[PDB]
């Protein structure tokens, strides 16, 4: 970096005309996701130092107060793209420290308190094929039928945990039935709204 435009590039703004608000897919969600921190610790009065992969942790949530790092390596504002090995965090302006959220995966779903709670209970539309059954499906405790025409069960059919076990025992390995989402929301995930729109 010639440093003749780095500060110049630091100050910028957009028009933001005709802004839209809508959902997305997890790709951009992890595109925002950058770091990985482990601990819930707030601050250590033992050394008055930031938590290591904790809250307000280094190698996470953006730069450090100075261009100096928490470990101490590559401590200069002149160092722009060099990443110290001791703790990997971008050494730059603290403004980006406000402009860095994270993404938390934990690899599994649960209840969305988005539907059936607001003045409009989108539940039915939100759960689509489940139709206000996504909340019940948020328990991984039914493993309802996913597919299976050989078994006398619809693909989008409710098979509670006991119902799932009975189907697996009776229909053998023909009555496919999965959970997470458990009651109906997985079959919602395996559904097409075009037929539902035509039927409605």
């Amino acid at each position: 970096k010639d440093l003749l435009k780095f500060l110049k590039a630091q100050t910028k703004t957009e028009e933001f005309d005709a802004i839209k608000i809508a959902l997305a897919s997890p790709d951009m969600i992890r595109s925002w996701s950058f770091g990985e921190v482990k601990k819930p610790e707030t601050i250590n009065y033992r050394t008055f130092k930031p938590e290591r992969d904790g809250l307000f942790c280094a190698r996470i949530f953006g730069p450090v107060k100075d261009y100096e790092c928490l470990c101490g390596k590559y401590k200069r504002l002149k160092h722009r793209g060099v990443i110290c090995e001791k703790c990997g965090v971008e050494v730059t302006q603290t403004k980006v420290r406000r402009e860095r959220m994270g993404h938390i995966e934990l690899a599994s779903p649960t209840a969305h308190i988005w539907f059936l709670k607001s003045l409009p209970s989108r539940i039915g539309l939100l759960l689509d094929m489940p139709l206000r059954d996504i909340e019940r499906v948020l328990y991984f405790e039914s493993y309802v039928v996913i597919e299976g025409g050989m078994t006398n069960l619809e693909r989008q059919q409710i098979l509670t945990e006991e119902q799932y076990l009975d189907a697996l025992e009776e229909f053998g390995d023909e009555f496919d039935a999965k959970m997470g989402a458990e009651a109906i929301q997985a079959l919602l995930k395996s559904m097409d709204l075009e037929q539902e729109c035509e039927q409605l």
Partner: peptide, 29 residues
């Protein structure tokens, strides 16, 4: 994010170990 990393790393470890559906489901919830 404590819970985030805890559950994600634990799930990654136990996934290779064929974790119980009960523990997996409680972690999921």
């Amino acid at each position: 994010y404590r819970r985030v990393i805890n559950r994600n790393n634990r799930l990654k470890r136990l996934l290779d170990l064929a974790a119980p559906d009960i523990i997996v489901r409680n972690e999921k919830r």
